[model samples]
Target: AQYEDGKQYTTLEKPVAGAPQVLEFFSFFCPHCYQFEEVLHISDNVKKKLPEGVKMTKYHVNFMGGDLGKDLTQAWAVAMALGVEDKVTVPLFEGVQKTQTIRSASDIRDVFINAGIKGEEYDAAWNSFVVKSLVAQQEKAAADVQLRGVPAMFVNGKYQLNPQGMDTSNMDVFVQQYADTVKYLSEK
Candidate 1:
């Protein structure tokens, strides 16, 4: 398994009670990542088809490493730590997608606060072991994982599962095949 029993992807490393790590690397501020999530979330109103362990996970990429940028990057790591994993992550992305003026960390904080996660929680979590682990993961990703952008998934750290990665036209069949492949990998 790409994931261990108590392992977390970036932070919040707990057992998800699901099958596999449908690991998605996305950003709340990215427009394309937002659309992809929306498209994937529509269960069979658009037929709701998806791979078994294939899920999207948010990874805030901060390349600047400046003062505020450092804080904002860690804030993202903490916001995701507080029980907002499955719940707030997607909506955070959606909120950013629909709005035109939400281009700051304060705006992101507002969404997290509205979702029942306090701003202090985000700040306090920055020092947590979980938060540190996530920070470590993100740092490693920045150094090791050779990715070009957000909205990409890596299966077992061995496969690149994006439709575009496979071939752009294969997108329609990609998710279905991906789900099947994850199942196959898990069972192996």
Candidate 2:
């Protein structure tokens, strides 16, 4: 079988063990990431196309949003804890990258409130040890990947996708190619 390493993906120096996992590094403040989520809907599309037993996890990069990055990451953790990530991810992206409404932690809290989570629930999750740990883990994952850009994808922590090798001219083709690459890399 033929494989393109550098052109398609570069092998990790220290490959972690997470087979059947697709890890995404992104930020709400990134316009490209916003497009990936909302405009292209690549993540959702790829998830549906992934092979059975494959799971995707997203890490909100803290380089963007300046001081607000950490806060937004925590908000993501809170959403996960409240089982509202599906409800709040896009809204947070719109607030930060489109409408520019989210400015503080309180604003992020309101996003949860709008998603039907009680203010107290949001508050508790925000301050809970689990949420804090999740935020820390996300930050650590970003650092581990030595990430330099937003909207980066890694398969099983071993193969980092190179956009240069992907056909992005068409949205449908790009999503299919992305999913196929992830599927191929996951088995490696």
Candidate 3:
């Protein structure tokens, strides 16, 4: 199978491994999140290696919500609400990982356009009740759940997960364990 660059991955595309895998690209301020990006991206390979039907996704978190975080999550929520959550995966991650733009909505608009949405649609999405609700949901995701460290990961909605807890050294081990855990839960 061909890997589809940003198209096959995203921060908001929640994994559906029968059990679920939800990975996060967290924090505009987390050095760990920054450091983990490379490892997590590579972990996509780990995901691809998993048993059939496993679903996984990456999410860009705006705990920092700097100007860019706000728009990024806006895009995330809009796609989810529009019933297009599966569509915006890669573009959302590309929008940030390439660079969390700081100039204006224009930068964000470009990303949304690439994600197959129009300028007018983007405007409406930004104002929709869904976006409003998601902002609040993501805010709580930042404040309450990931209380200590970031780039913090989750599996199946209840596990406060991460590679570091598995260990800071040997990311391969981390990725492997992450896959192993997801595989187990997804199977059960």
Candidate 4:
């Protein structure tokens, strides 16, 4: 830990709910972020390292629209709504990055289906009112995060982390920084 979290991040005026909200700003179309997913293995860290009482949210941002990004965002919201994001997040990233065929809702649905999600269940969730609402809310949240980059993390909405962004070169250190910052903040 050569770097200090305090010096690297800015505190928010309004603390996010759940006291310490670990919000990750990510986009499927960002190759750097996608690479971070591969190297940092953040999902595993979130499940294994984050403390109790700490809440997690993955806010999908669409800075560079691949036409399919929005549909994927909606699909993400659907997974979150169905409480299946845990099952879908990594696979979705891999599917989009590897397959490069998810340009429509139907394509996204196929990814979900191939991930073993029932077709009818996924279709039902794809356009549900809740899914629509989450997409809107997440979009608003991304705008509110103040930074315009993917792989940026906010702890309790107070600390905007990894300001250097999650490029492959900094992945190992970045993962440690995220763990330490979130752990320190959660104890506060």
Q: Pick the candidate with the highest lDDT.
A: 2
Model 1 misplaced regions, further than 4 Å: 1-22, 42-58, 63-73, 126-130, 165-174, 185-188
The backbone clash count of each candidate, in order, is 8, 0, 6, 0
**Per-model CA lDDT versus the true structure:** 0.53, 0.82, 0.56, 0.71
- Model 2: which residue pairs collide? none
Candidate 2's TM-score reads 0.92
Question: Can you write out model 2's per-residue Cα lDDT over 148-183, one digit (the tens) per residue?
Answer: 898898888788987678777897787778777777
Q: Tens-digit lDDT track for model 3 on 1-188?
A: 22221222212243333333554446534555544544455346557666766556544566455776676677667766666655555444445555655345576567667767777887898799878887776665555443445565555554544353354377676666656655554444
Better of 2 and 4 by lDDT: 2
Assess the local accuracy of residue 134 in candidate 3 as a C-alpha lDDT between 0 and 100: 71
Model 4: how far residue 104 lies from native, Å: 2.2
- Which is the better candidate, 1 or 4, if ranked by TM-score? 4
Off by more than 4 A, model 2: 1-3, 18-20
Q: Candidate 3, which segments miss by more than 4 Å at Cα?
A: 1-39, 42-60, 83-102, 146-148, 156-158, 165-173, 183-188
Q: RMSD in angstroms, all models? A: 8.5, 1.7, 8.9, 3.2
Best model number under TM-score: 2
For each candidate in turn, the TM-score is 0.62, 0.92, 0.59, 0.81
lDDT (C-alpha) at residue 37 in model 1: 57
Clashing pairs in 1: 8-13, 10-134, 22-54, 22-55, 43-48, 44-47, 44-48, 51-179
lDDT score for residue 47 of model 1: 23
The local distance difference test score of model 1 is 0.53
| lDDT per residue as tens, model 1, 14-48 | 22333224445655655655665565441221123
Single out the weakest 10-residue window by summed lDDT for candidate 1: 5-14
